[PDB]
Amino acid sequence: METGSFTVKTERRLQVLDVTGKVEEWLSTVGGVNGLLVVYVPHTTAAVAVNEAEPRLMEDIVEFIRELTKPGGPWKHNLVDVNAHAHLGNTIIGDSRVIPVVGGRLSLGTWQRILFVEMDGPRERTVNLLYLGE
Amino acid sequence: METGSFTVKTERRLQVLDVTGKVEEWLSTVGGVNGLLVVYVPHTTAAVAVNEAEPRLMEDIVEFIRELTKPGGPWKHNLVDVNAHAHLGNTIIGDSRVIPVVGGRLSLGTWQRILFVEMDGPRERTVNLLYLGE
Amino acid sequence: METGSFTVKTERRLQVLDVTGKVEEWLSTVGGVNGLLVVYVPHTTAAVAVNEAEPRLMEDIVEFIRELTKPGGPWKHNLVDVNAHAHLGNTIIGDSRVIPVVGGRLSLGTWQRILFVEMDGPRERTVNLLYLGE
């Protein structure tokens, strides 16, 4: 298997970023033909999702997250830190995605993209990558 | 590895369908004994989950989704299209699931089933399948 | 591949438990160096997530879940059983996680931990484990 990573500099507290490009980069630096790619982040207050990188939708995702997780809301973790909402967002969005690579083609749908979801920015974040296959 | 897919015709805007049968089908057409199966959909407005295929629960799942994602709600993606809620549902449900295959047995729990979650139907949808192992 | 499991005795209806220790245990009983570990639960009313095992945060996670899934709320599954909320929580948290093992190191972030999320306790639950690699 092959293994790699790249950084993602986020600019806002909540922000969705399309990192598909960097993933494919690494992936071609590996030249995998048939196998699985695992995209994952080692952060508990950031997540990764797969969906459409349409600007307005990306705004909606942040607002959707803000609504459900309540940044600054009545969370007991507030006694300890101020990012409770980010941890909560991470738990129902997820921190890793498995993506098949078939015949050299990263198996994403026509409108699917790899989105880094920052919930405690601005920070210099990391995305780790693992390729398992031929 | 082996690779396959099947279509799923959805009938309603929001609908949960049990597609366990078709997955096992393909899986036996492959005869995998020990390995991993990846069930994933290339759609950004549909998802896949694993849970109980009880009729009333399946209704509840749609209502749960409707409540959190607000179809037709105040989403900026509305300027572009009318399925913002579906994209949102997809992000916290997920578009792929990894399921171990051990000793020829698809490793699902007694009450676990593979559910296709349509949020922008009626459409002719696709489920892709990947088997990696011996 | 290697395969294993361990039980998790939950004490409350909703409860988050850090089971990282037991996973690493098994993992060393296997001595994997490079590969993937799949942590998954065969339950439809329990889930697994990866995040920080801070006590107050863990309380917040349960309250967050309680808020979104409404235990005892107006769910049609209520005609059949009383755990509708748990099924709902399971669908947007997930029942399996893939974790890379690189150079003998379980690839979790500094503050990431494997959390069992019980939503229909108290019960004697199971976590299944699969290691695929060298």
From TrEMBL, chains A, B, C:
Belongs to the UPF0047 family. Signal peptide: none annotated. Coiled coil: none annotated. InterPro entries: UPF0047_YjbQ-like, YjbQ-like_sf. This is YjbQ family protein. Gene3D superfamilies: YjbQ-like (2.60.120.460).
